[PDB]
Design an enzyme around this catalytic site. Structure first.
Site, PDB file in Angstrom:
ATOM      1  N   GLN A  90     -10.862  13.013  -7.550  1.00  0.00           N
ATOM      2  CA  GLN A  90     -12.086  12.518  -8.166  1.00  0.00           C
ATOM      3  C   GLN A  90     -13.182  13.576  -8.184  1.00  0.00           C
ATOM      4  O   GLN A  90     -13.819  13.793  -9.217  1.00  0.00           O
ATOM      5  CB  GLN A  90     -12.577  11.265  -7.444  1.00  0.00           C
ATOM      6  CG  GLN A  90     -13.987  10.874  -7.816  1.00  0.00           C
ATOM      7  CD  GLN A  90     -14.345   9.495  -7.323  1.00  0.00           C
ATOM      8  OE1 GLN A  90     -13.590   8.879  -6.573  1.00  0.00           O
ATOM      9  NE2 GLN A  90     -15.501   8.998  -7.745  1.00  0.00           N
TER      10      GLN A  90
ATOM     11  N   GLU B 198      -8.795  42.707  -9.698  1.00  0.00           N
ATOM     12  CA  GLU B 198      -9.722  43.586  -8.993  1.00  0.00           C
ATOM     13  C   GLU B 198     -10.394  42.853  -7.841  1.00  0.00           C
ATOM     14  O   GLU B 198     -10.445  43.349  -6.711  1.00  0.00           O
ATOM     15  CB  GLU B 198     -10.779  44.118  -9.965  1.00  0.00           C
ATOM     16  CG  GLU B 198     -10.233  44.842 -11.188  1.00  0.00           C
ATOM     17  CD  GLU B 198      -9.763  46.241 -10.876  1.00  0.00           C
ATOM     18  OE1 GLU B 198     -10.008  46.703  -9.749  1.00  0.00           O
ATOM     19  OE2 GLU B 198      -9.137  46.874 -11.751  1.00  0.00           O
TER      20      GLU B 198
HETATM   21  N1  LIG Z   1     -19.858  17.709  -3.372  1.00  0.00           N
HETATM   22  C1  LIG Z   1     -19.217  16.598  -4.051  1.00  0.00           C
HETATM   23  N2  LIG Z   1     -18.189  15.799  -3.335  1.00  0.00           N
HETATM   24  C2  LIG Z   1     -17.523  14.659  -4.019  1.00  0.00           C
HETATM   25  C3  LIG Z   1     -17.852  14.340  -5.322  1.00  0.00           C
HETATM   26  N3  LIG Z   1     -17.112  13.288  -5.681  1.00  0.00           N
HETATM   27  C4  LIG Z   1     -16.321  12.944  -4.627  1.00  0.00           C
HETATM   28  N4  LIG Z   1     -16.592  13.808  -3.607  1.00  0.00           N
HETATM   29  C5  LIG Z   1     -15.912  13.724  -2.318  1.00  0.00           C
HETATM   30  O1  LIG Z   1     -14.327  13.544  -2.536  1.00  0.00           O
HETATM   31  C6  LIG Z   1     -13.872  12.927  -1.475  1.00  0.00           C
HETATM   32  C7  LIG Z   1     -12.832  11.850  -1.940  1.00  0.00           C
HETATM   33  O2  LIG Z   1     -12.154  12.431  -2.984  1.00  0.00           O
HETATM   34  P1  LIG Z   1     -11.046  11.579  -3.843  1.00  0.00           P
HETATM   35  O3  LIG Z   1     -10.817  12.310  -5.142  1.00  0.00           O
HETATM   36  O4  LIG Z   1     -11.544  10.161  -4.121  1.00  0.00           O
HETATM   37  O5  LIG Z   1      -9.618  11.525  -2.989  1.00  0.00           O
HETATM   38  P2  LIG Z   1      -8.138  11.480  -3.732  1.00  0.00           P
HETATM   39  O6  LIG Z   1      -7.336  12.706  -3.369  1.00  0.00           O
HETATM   40  O7  LIG Z   1      -8.332  11.399  -5.237  1.00  0.00           O
HETATM   41  O8  LIG Z   1      -7.363  10.103  -3.249  1.00  0.00           O
HETATM   42  P3  LIG Z   1      -7.955   8.640  -3.741  1.00  0.00           P
HETATM   43  O9  LIG Z   1      -9.395   8.522  -3.289  1.00  0.00           O
HETATM   44  O10 LIG Z   1      -7.136   7.519  -3.145  1.00  0.00           O
HETATM   45  O11 LIG Z   1      -7.891   8.584  -5.253  1.00  0.00           O
HETATM   46  C8  LIG Z   1     -15.080  12.288  -0.803  1.00  0.00           C
HETATM   47  O12 LIG Z   1     -15.236  12.822   0.442  1.00  0.00           O
HETATM   48  C9  LIG Z   1     -16.292  12.668  -1.693  1.00  0.00           C
HETATM   49  O13 LIG Z   1     -17.469  13.003  -0.847  1.00  0.00           O
HETATM   50  C10 LIG Z   1     -18.924  15.165  -6.077  1.00  0.00           C
HETATM   51  O14 LIG Z   1     -19.211  14.892  -7.200  1.00  0.00           O
HETATM   52  N5  LIG Z   1     -19.575  16.273  -5.416  1.00  0.00           N
HETATM   53  N1  LIG Z   2     -21.790  58.692 -13.557  1.00  0.00           N
HETATM   54  C1  LIG Z   2     -21.253  57.301 -13.732  1.00  0.00           C
HETATM   55  N2  LIG Z   2     -20.332  56.750 -12.752  1.00  0.00           N
HETATM   56  C2  LIG Z   2     -19.797  55.358 -12.932  1.00  0.00           C
HETATM   57  C3  LIG Z   2     -20.167  54.615 -13.996  1.00  0.00           C
HETATM   58  N3  LIG Z   2     -19.555  53.434 -13.916  1.00  0.00           N
HETATM   59  C4  LIG Z   2     -18.794  53.419 -12.803  1.00  0.00           C
HETATM   60  N4  LIG Z   2     -18.965  54.608 -12.221  1.00  0.00           N
HETATM   61  C5  LIG Z   2     -18.134  54.640 -10.984  1.00  0.00           C
HETATM   62  O1  LIG Z   2     -16.849  54.481 -11.304  1.00  0.00           O
HETATM   63  C6  LIG Z   2     -16.149  53.869  -9.973  1.00  0.00           C
HETATM   64  C7  LIG Z   2     -15.092  52.837 -10.333  1.00  0.00           C
HETATM   65  O2  LIG Z   2     -14.112  53.412 -11.122  1.00  0.00           O
HETATM   66  P1  LIG Z   2     -13.505  52.494 -12.368  1.00  0.00           P
HETATM   67  O3  LIG Z   2     -13.237  53.380 -13.584  1.00  0.00           O
HETATM   68  O4  LIG Z   2     -14.525  51.394 -12.737  1.00  0.00           O
HETATM   69  O5  LIG Z   2     -12.076  51.782 -11.881  1.00  0.00           O
HETATM   70  P2  LIG Z   2     -10.641  52.021 -12.675  1.00  0.00           P
HETATM   71  O6  LIG Z   2     -10.768  51.530 -14.088  1.00  0.00           O
HETATM   72  O7  LIG Z   2      -9.554  51.274 -11.989  1.00  0.00           O
HETATM   73  O8  LIG Z   2     -10.309  53.482 -12.683  1.00  0.00           O
HETATM   74  C8  LIG Z   2     -17.086  53.303  -9.273  1.00  0.00           C
HETATM   75  O9  LIG Z   2     -17.245  54.023  -8.002  1.00  0.00           O
HETATM   76  C9  LIG Z   2     -18.410  53.434 -10.119  1.00  0.00           C
HETATM   77  O10 LIG Z   2     -19.468  53.668  -9.318  1.00  0.00           O
HETATM   78  C10 LIG Z   2     -21.121  55.185 -15.025  1.00  0.00           C
HETATM   79  O11 LIG Z   2     -21.433  54.527 -15.943  1.00  0.00           O
HETATM   80  N5  LIG Z   2     -21.652  56.522 -14.865  1.00  0.00           N
HETATM   81 MG   LIG Z   3      -9.973   8.846  -5.160  1.00  0.00          MG
END
Ligand SMILES: Nc1nc2c(ncn2[C@@H]2O[C@H](COP(=O)(O)OP(=O)(O)OP(=O)(O)O)[C@@H](O)[C@H]2O)c(=O)[nH]1
Ligand SMILES: Nc1nc2c(ncn2[C@@H]2O[C@H](COP(=O)(O)OP(=O)(O)O)[C@@H](O)[C@H]2O)c(=O)[nH]1
Ligand SMILES: [Mg+2]
Ligand SMILES: CC(=O)O[C@H]1C(=O)[C@@]2(C)[C@H]([C@H](OC(=O)c3ccccc3)[C@]3(O)C[C@H](OC(=O)[C@H](O)[C@@H](NC(=O)c4ccccc4)c4ccccc4)C(C)=C1C3(C)C)[C@]1(OC(C)=O)CO[C@@H]1C[C@@H]2O
Lengths: 428, 436, 619
Positions: free
Chosen positions: B11, B254
């Site tokens: 839910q 990454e």
């Molecule tokens: N932060 C947050 N928590 C939520 C929300 N809605 C439900 N919860 C929490 O979800 C938990 C229950 O989740 P469920 O989805 O009903 O459990 P289930 O796995 O689906 O099993 P059943 O309840 O039998 O359908 C509760 O602890 C709620 O606090 C939300 O919108 N925001």
């Molecule tokens: N002089 C300069 N250095 C950069 C720039 N952008 C990234 N760097 C450096 O490039 C490093 C990352 O390498 P990157 O090419 O993004 O990863 P890769 O694609 O896997 O090789 C990091 O340490 C950045 O700080 C830039 O625009 N100018």
């Molecule tokens: Mg439920």
């Protein structure tokens, strides 16, 4: 020649690529219609590095977008410059990533590699001289780590001689947007070390400070962070794109920055950077740019260079300047803080410069640094991984894709071996 | 494409099924008669609802849900209420007889005859989705249908899919307030058969939400609609990433990978913020800091469980409206500075956050206010064992007397299911202590 | 300042189906241009009133009854919304601007009540939408089907139903009153698959007539939509029926895609031999006009018959007066217009009364005081470039996309000569000497050549002047002997042509489109991509530097007149440099401008397919 093919893995990699492909599209003066409307011949001389010809005097980017969960690929397609991409260069899978490295690298990765590798090849012969690859990662996520490295392994076994760049964005030490983050980090590290030549590491943290203090930003969005990375991504290839009295290909940057086959994790920063206030007071001089970039703030990686020792370094300026200034500047610094540098390397900097400036500015710079302070990041990650693997947390996900635990032992051992190597050449 | 199946059993499940399906149709403009204005290509809006709807051959949108119940009175009410033109009567299921607060009546005798009907509608509903993100169950533990039918279903689902993820929002028997008397039994009997079949499980009780509407909303007349009105707000905050944009989108996979460390431990809590009326929103700025503070507050939890007696194994926060991620990074740091908030050692991480630009939507005549921000939190904490233990005490307090048991053994059961499910209660509880 | 009287405009939107309209009980003819609508006087072929509110190009045109406001569709780019615009009459300005149909607009129509306006999406996004006229807002919307519809028509009575036909589908839609929906009813035809093109409804909604690519004219009842009679007996229209209309007497005018314009009397007749069977539609009168017929509008003269304005795909407007009394159908050609993308302008030297226009199909000749084009020298497939008059009054030179130059005369007779392989491909600029003794040809593959020409013997010399890109323009001093070649690299080169040694002049900031001498001076004026009208020195200098494509000067350097990608025309006091007397409303990329030497007239022509005439006043 020197054409460059581009990949965009994961969300972030897909996203920063929207800016990098929007900045460059303007630097070369083309429209979202794909039709060039700049002014000079220099925009057209080396336009081939980032684009292809098209019917009707149109240029489309040589980019490949891979991502599971194509949700974000609609965003970039709806972005202002989504019309330029080839809609056949949109590979995606509907199932998410899960931030699992395994499925991103074992199950879901495997089902897209055949399509992707068909795409990559479809534009590998279109290059008269393919210089190298370049990728955009994020080690935390699942696609980026998983697919990218799996994609990376496939590239190496068919394009070994070429060079595999990596604009990887690492996880953060203090922040964790995800939880399993350290896993996909280490599992990728076991893949980057053996199938990569250069790997810049960048982190959102310093990206927040650099946005906060210097630019005086109030609300850093993601586009702005990517707006920054778009800049340093464009600052690299000025030598391949524009003239320069001292040009610098990538392959000469690598040989100038990595003495050993496994010390290839870098660090970056941009210059100049100023709000609308101080730009009306500050002046653009070679001294300005070099002190700012050399500082330990602009280092977008969440590391402190003072705790380490610069094995190598570099600088990429752009704008008409006296190269002798830049020659002595790097010679001044190499003398003053002589403790932060190494001894068995006499001159451990490379000083490049280009003759073409940015669009609206007139001078700019970019820093690179291979310090041993970058091992600090690998210490943090190796802790978080061994803390949860001590308890096998979140682990049923990973064995859920055929994976095992030896892989988690192996990847950690390699991380320990790595960070140890950055300690040998760190004699305090 | 990214579509989920919202099942409502018992839910209460079909009670919240009213509120959520009152919320969703409002956020998307879905009129009670299936359709909405500017429905066709004239509107130019797609994918905004497919997660929760199925556009007909033309116009109408039938919600993808299922109302199941043995008590005909409530399901027949919706058939009569305003929202009858929405539901296809193949969804609204009923039965001649109820379960009457017996587990067997919901599980052994009646349930077996209508589940086949339910599965037939799900199979009629599963085939309509292209990408199925995951099942979304709405249970109410403490009754015959909920405990009886839900449990029986999840078994049928798992043996059908297995590969699919299961997710469930289930209301648990409160410690103090109790509308039933035998709910301990079926609750015990529900907890078991869900556990080995559900993948993740969120928990929350009315008594907690009874205080929420008291302290914050300041209403003295709470009824089941209000509580359900809130659960609507919670899930709308979660699925937003599946059905909108914004930084850090999250999907279930990454979200699930980074929140379940161990196969058994998946029981989680929740919380929402802000919870205010119209006038407080006038005397308030609603910064991201306070909203994330009221989120982690043990008062604002939706279950009568105190997390300050346990440790957060992980957390997930889904903001909303106007947020930027530095603020998340800012405020999440502040919390990790505090002391009253504990974490188990093996996870230095623990925050999978996310934003969405789309604002939270209020219902007319409702109680909540119009805000540009909100937060919803989900933490898998080990402190959840306490309310799991109270029920552990009420069972043996009655089962010793063998009171009310003749219903169960009379309805096609035995005493074994009491002892068998009794041990799973203790077995689970010790696992909540092994993690210490 | 914008004082420039627009004396004459010649143009017509050819392939815009049903684009031609006549003002109901009015004195105006309405028809579209490149991006505008034109309301000409019905009688005075000078009084034009143009309406310009679209961005790309008008695509469809509808005019409500009672001379009330008219709607105009629009084509746009790939992923940007179309723009239906409602234009008021009795005020002649915009009222509503509605946006949908992301690709283009396919069809528009008003209802008998002027309150409803129905639209039809493009090839993609093909949906049927209804609009309100008081509020420029969409009432109803629905996608028809996969087979994309082509034309839609409101019923003459009961302004609540409308019929629409397309590829393999016909439907009648009725707008429901209870909601924002409209219900369709499909057409049932016996095993017939016809690609309906045009649809008309009779006065009393009895029978809908519908043309067909096969050539039939299917007439169907409309109470129930089923089919009744096939089409014209004693044959079948050649290129399929395209432009169909109804004469008030109950008969139908049909115009196929070949020029066959005929009258079918459609009264249900019984088959003579087989009584319970019907005949096909006979043909009262028939005629042949030049080109595929695309638009038909009516004019009730009522003395003998009716005069129908017929716009054909060849941009010709005919006045077809038909009287059913003696079943006599006579056509007249009222106005002609060029087809599309007029490439080159030409004035005969020391003549300011006749001029010539090279277009993409053939060369036409017009004169000043009236349009009244003189002749059209036709070359079937390949297009003409850079028409030229040999100096002092002589033949017409024309270089074609073949890479060959050909010469014609006044009556132009037969080809005077054909210099074949004059360049690699697509000779682009052509000039002659002041003595008509040599001809310069700058090709598109970055080369310049010159041919010596005798009286009846041609001389093919091997100059081979190599340039850096396509030669947009070539000029030569009429005073002495020299040469200037522009480029799509902008490096305008001064050739001496006495020694052919490329006098080393170079101008490189962008690539140029038009260069002109100052008459009897060492100055230069060049125009290229960036806005640059820089005055140079013949002695390797730049006097001054002030999207432009075409330039022209007067007898002396009074008024430099200019135009380009911008849709304007800028006149300049050459010595002073002010933009006095600027003209507007040239909907397209203007290509050439001329000064009419003896008189004060500026002729402007662009890719839109039209020609404009202005006066000339300089301070
Ligand atoms: N932060 C947050 N928590 C939520 C929300 N809605 C439900 N919860 C929490 O979800 C938990 C229950 O989740 P469920 O989805 O009903 O459990 P289930 O796995 O689906 O099993 P059943 O309840 O039998 O359908 C509760 O602890 C709620 O606090 C939300 O919108 N925001
Ligand atoms: N002089 C300069 N250095 C950069 C720039 N952008 C990234 N760097 C450096 O490039 C490093 C990352 O390498 P990157 O090419 O993004 O990863 P890769 O694609 O896997 O090789 C990091 O340490 C950045 O700080 C830039 O625009 N100018
Ligand atoms: Mg439920
Ligand atoms: C009048 C003027 O000079 O204004 C500047 C300006 O004042 C400042 C503050 C600009 C401005 O940048 C920012 O405000 C900003 C905001 C978020 C993140 C990063 C920057 C500027 O936006 C940035 C912009 O810079 C550019 O356009 C660069 O060429 C840059 N372009 C883009 O990033 C871009 C791309 C597509 C569309 C729009 C911009 C670039 C960088 C690398 C490679 C190629 C191009 C310019 C000069 C300005 C404004 C407009 C204020 C600054 O940025 C740049 C990139 O120059 C911020 O620090 C510098 C200092 C500049 O002085």
């Amino acid at each position: 020649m020197r054409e460059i093919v581009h990949i965009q893995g994961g969300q972030c990699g897909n996203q920063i690529g929207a800016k990098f492909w929007e900045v460059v599209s303007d630097e070369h003066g083309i429209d979202p219609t794909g039709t060039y409307h700049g002014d000079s011949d220099l925009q057209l001389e080396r336009i081939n590095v980032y684009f292809n010809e098209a019917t009707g005097g149109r240029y489309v980017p040589r980019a490949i977008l891979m991502d599971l969960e194509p949700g974000t690929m609609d965003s970039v397609r709806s972005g202002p410059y989504g019309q330029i991409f080839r809609p056949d260069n949109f590979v995606f899978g509907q199932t998410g990533a899960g931030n699992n490295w395994a499925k991103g690298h074992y199950t879901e990765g495997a089902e897209l590699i055949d399509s992707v590798l068909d795409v990559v090849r479809k534009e590998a012969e279109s290059c008269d001289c393919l210089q190298g690859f370049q990728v955009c990662h994020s080690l935390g996520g699942g696609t980026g780590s998983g697919m990218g490295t799996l994609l990376i392994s496939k590239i190496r076994e068919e394009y070994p001689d070429r060079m595999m760049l990596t604009f990887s964005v690492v996880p953060s030490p203090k922040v964790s947007d995800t939880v399993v983050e350290p896993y996909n980090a280490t599992l990728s590290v076991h893949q980057l070390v053996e199938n990569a030549d250069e790997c810049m590491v960048l982190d959102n943290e310093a990206l927040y400070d650099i946005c906060f203090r210097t630019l005086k930003l109030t609300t850093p969005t993601f586009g702005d962070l990517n707006h920054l990375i778009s800049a340093v991504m464009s600052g690299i290839t000025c030598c391949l794109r524009f003239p320069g009295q001292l040009n610098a290909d990538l392959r000469k940057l690598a040989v100038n920055l990595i003495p050993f086959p496994r010390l290839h994790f870098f660090m970056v920063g941009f210059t100049p950077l100023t709000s609308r206030g101080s730009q009306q007071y500050r002046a653009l001089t070679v001294p300005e740019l070099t002190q700012q970039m050399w500082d330990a703030k602009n280092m977008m990686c969440a590391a402190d260079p003072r705790h380490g020792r610069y094995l190598t370094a570099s600088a990429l300026f752009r704008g008409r300047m006296s190269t002798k200034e830049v020659d002595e500047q790097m010679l001044n610094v190499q003398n003053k803080n002589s403790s932060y540098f190494v001894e068995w390397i006499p001159n451990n900097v490379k000083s490049s410069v280009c003759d073409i400036p940015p669009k609206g500015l007139k001078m700019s710079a970019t820093f690179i640094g291979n310090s041993t302070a970058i091992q600090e990041m690998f210490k943090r990650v190796s802790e978080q991984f061994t803390a949860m693997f001590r308890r096998k947390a979140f682990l049923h996900w990973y064995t859920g894709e055929g994976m095992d635990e030896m892989e988690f032992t192996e990847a950690e051992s390699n991380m320990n071996d790595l960070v140890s190597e950055y300690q040998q050449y760190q004699d305090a | 494409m990214r579509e989920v199946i919202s099942i409502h059993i018992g839910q209460a499940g079909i009670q919240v099924g009213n509120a959520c399906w009152e919320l969703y149709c409002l956020e998307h403009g879905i009129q009670p008669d299936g359709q909405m204005p500017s429905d066709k290509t004239i509107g130019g809006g797609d994918d905004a609802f497919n997660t929760f709807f199925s556009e007909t051959g033309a116009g109408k949108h039938v919600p993808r849900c299922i109302f199941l119940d043995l008590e005909p009175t409530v399901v027949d009410e919706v058939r009569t209420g305003t929202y009858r033109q929405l539901f296809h009567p193949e969804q609204l299921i009923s039965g001649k007889e109820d379960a009457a607060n017996n587990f067997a009546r919901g599980h052994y005798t009646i349930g077996k005859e209508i589940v086949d009907l339910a599965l037939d509608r799900i199979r009629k509903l599963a085939d309509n989705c292209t990408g199925l993100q995951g099942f979304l169950v709405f249970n109410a533990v403490g009754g015959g249908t909920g405990s009886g039918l839900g449990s029986l279903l999840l078994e049928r689902l798992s043996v059908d899919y297995g590969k699919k993820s299961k997710l469930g929002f289930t209301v648990y028997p409160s410690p103090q307030v109790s509308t039933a008397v035998v709910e301990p039994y079926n609750s015990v009997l529900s907890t078991h058969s869900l556990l080995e079949h559900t993948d993740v499980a969120v928990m929350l009780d009315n008594e907690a939400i009874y205080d929420i509407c008291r302290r914050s909303l300041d209403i003295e007349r709470p009824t089941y609609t209000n509580l359900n009105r809130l659960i609507a707000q919670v899930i709308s905050s979660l699925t937003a990433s599946l059905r909108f944009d914004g930084a850090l989108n999250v999907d279930i996979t990454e979200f699930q990978t980074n929140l379940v460390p161990y196969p058994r431990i998946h029981f989680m809590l929740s919380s929402y913020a802000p919870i205010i009326s119209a006038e407080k929103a006038y005397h308030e700025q609603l910064s991201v800091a306070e909203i994330t503070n009221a989120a982690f507050e043990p008062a604002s939890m939706m279950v009568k469980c105190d997390p300050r007696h346990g440790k957060y194994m992980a957390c997930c926060l889904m903001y909303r409206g106007d947020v930027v991620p530095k603020d998340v990074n800012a405020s999440v740091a502040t919390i990790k500075t505090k002391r009253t908030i504990q974490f188990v050692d093996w996870c230095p991480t623990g925050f999978k956050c996310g934003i969405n630009y789309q604002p939270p939507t209020v219902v007319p005549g409702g109680d909540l206010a119009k805000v540009q921000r909100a937060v919803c939190m989900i933490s898998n904490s080990t402190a959840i064992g306490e309310i799991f233990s109270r029920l552990d005490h009420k069972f043996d307090l009655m089962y010793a007397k063998r009171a009310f048991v003749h219903w169960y053994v009379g309805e096609g059961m035995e005493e074994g299911e009491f002892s068998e499910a009794r041990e799973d209660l203790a077995a689970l509880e010790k696992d909540f202590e092994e993690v210490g | 300042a914008e004082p420039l009287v627009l004396n004459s405009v010649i143009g017509f939107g050819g392939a815009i189906e049903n684009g031609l309209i006549a003002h109901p009980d009015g004195r105006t003819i309405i028809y579209p241009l490149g991006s505008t609508i034109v309301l000409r006087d019905r009688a005075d072929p000078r009084s034009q009133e143009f309406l310009q509110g679209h961005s790309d190009k008008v695509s469809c045109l509808a005019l409500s009854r009672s001379g009330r406001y008219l709607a105009s569709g629009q084509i746009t780019y790939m992923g940007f919304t179309a723009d239906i615009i409602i234009w008021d009459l009795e005020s002649k300005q915009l009222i509503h601007r509605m946006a949908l149909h992301k690709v283009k607009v396919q069809a528009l129509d008003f209802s008998c009540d002027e309150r409803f306006l129905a639209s039809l999406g493009g090839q993609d996004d093909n949906a049927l939408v209804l609009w309100d006229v008081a509020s420029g807002n969409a009432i109803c919307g629905s996608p028809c089907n996969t087979n994309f519809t082509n034309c839609v028509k409101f019923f003459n009575n009961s302004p609540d139903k409308l019929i629409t036909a397309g590829n393999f589908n016909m439907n009648v839609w009725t707008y429901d009153a209870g909601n924002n929906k409209l219900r369709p009813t499909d057409a049932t035809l016996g095993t017939l698959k016809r690609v309906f093109k045009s649809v008309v409804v009779d006065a009393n909604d009895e029978y809908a007539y519908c043309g067909t690519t096969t050539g039939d004219v299917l007439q169907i009842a409309l109470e129930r939509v089923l089919f009744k009679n096939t089409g014209p007996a004693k044959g079948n229209v050649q290129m399929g029926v395209t432009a169909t209309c109804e004469v008030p007497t109950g008969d139908i005018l049909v115009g196929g895609g070949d020029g066959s314009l005929q009258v079918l009397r459609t009264v249900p007749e019984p088959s003579s031999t087989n009584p319970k069977l019907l005949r096909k539609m006979p043909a009262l009168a028939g005629t042949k006009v030049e080109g595929a017929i695309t638009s038909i509008a009516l004019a009730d003269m009522n003395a003998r018959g009716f005069t129908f304005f017929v716009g054909t795909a060849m941009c010709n407007i005919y006045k077809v007066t038909y009287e059913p009394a003696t079943s006599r159908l006579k056509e007249e050609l009222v106005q002609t217009a060029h087809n599309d993308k007029i490439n080159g302008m030409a004035f005969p030297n020391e003549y300011s009364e006749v001029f010539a226009t090279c277009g993409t199909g053939f060369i036409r000749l017009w004169h000043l005081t009236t349009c009244r084009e003189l002749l059209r020298i036709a070359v079937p497939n390949l297009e003409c470039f850079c028409i030229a008059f040999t100096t002092d009054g002589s033949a017409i030179l024309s270089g074609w996309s073949d890479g060959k130059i050909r010469a014609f005369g006044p009556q132009s007779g037969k080809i005077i000569f054909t210099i074949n392989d004059a360049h690699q491909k697509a000779v682009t600029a052509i000039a002659s000497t002041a003595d008509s003794s040599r001809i310069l040809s700058g090709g598109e593959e970055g080369m310049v050549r010159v041919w010596r020409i005798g009286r009846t013997s041609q001389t093919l010399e091997a100059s081979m002047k190599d340039h850096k890109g396509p030669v947009n323009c070539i000029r030569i001093k009429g005073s002495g002997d020299e040469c200037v070649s522009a480029s799509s690299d902008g490096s305008c080169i001064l050739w001496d042509l006495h020694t052919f040694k490329r006098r080393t002049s170079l101008f490189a900031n962008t690539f140029f489109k038009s260069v002109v001498y100052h008459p009897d001076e060492s100055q230069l004026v060049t125009a290229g991509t960036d806005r640059k009208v820089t005055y140079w020195d013949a002695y390797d200098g730049n006097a001054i530097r002030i999207e432009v494509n075409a330039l022209a000067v007067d007898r002396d350097g009074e008024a430099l007149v200019s135009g380009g990608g911008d849709k304007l025309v800028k006149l300049w006091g050459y010595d002073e440099g002010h933009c006095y007397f600027v003209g507007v409303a040239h909907s397209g990329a203007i290509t050439a401008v001329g000064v009419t030497p003896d008189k004060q007239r500026i002729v402007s022509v662009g890719t839109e397919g039209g020609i404009f005439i202005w006066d000339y006043q300089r301070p």
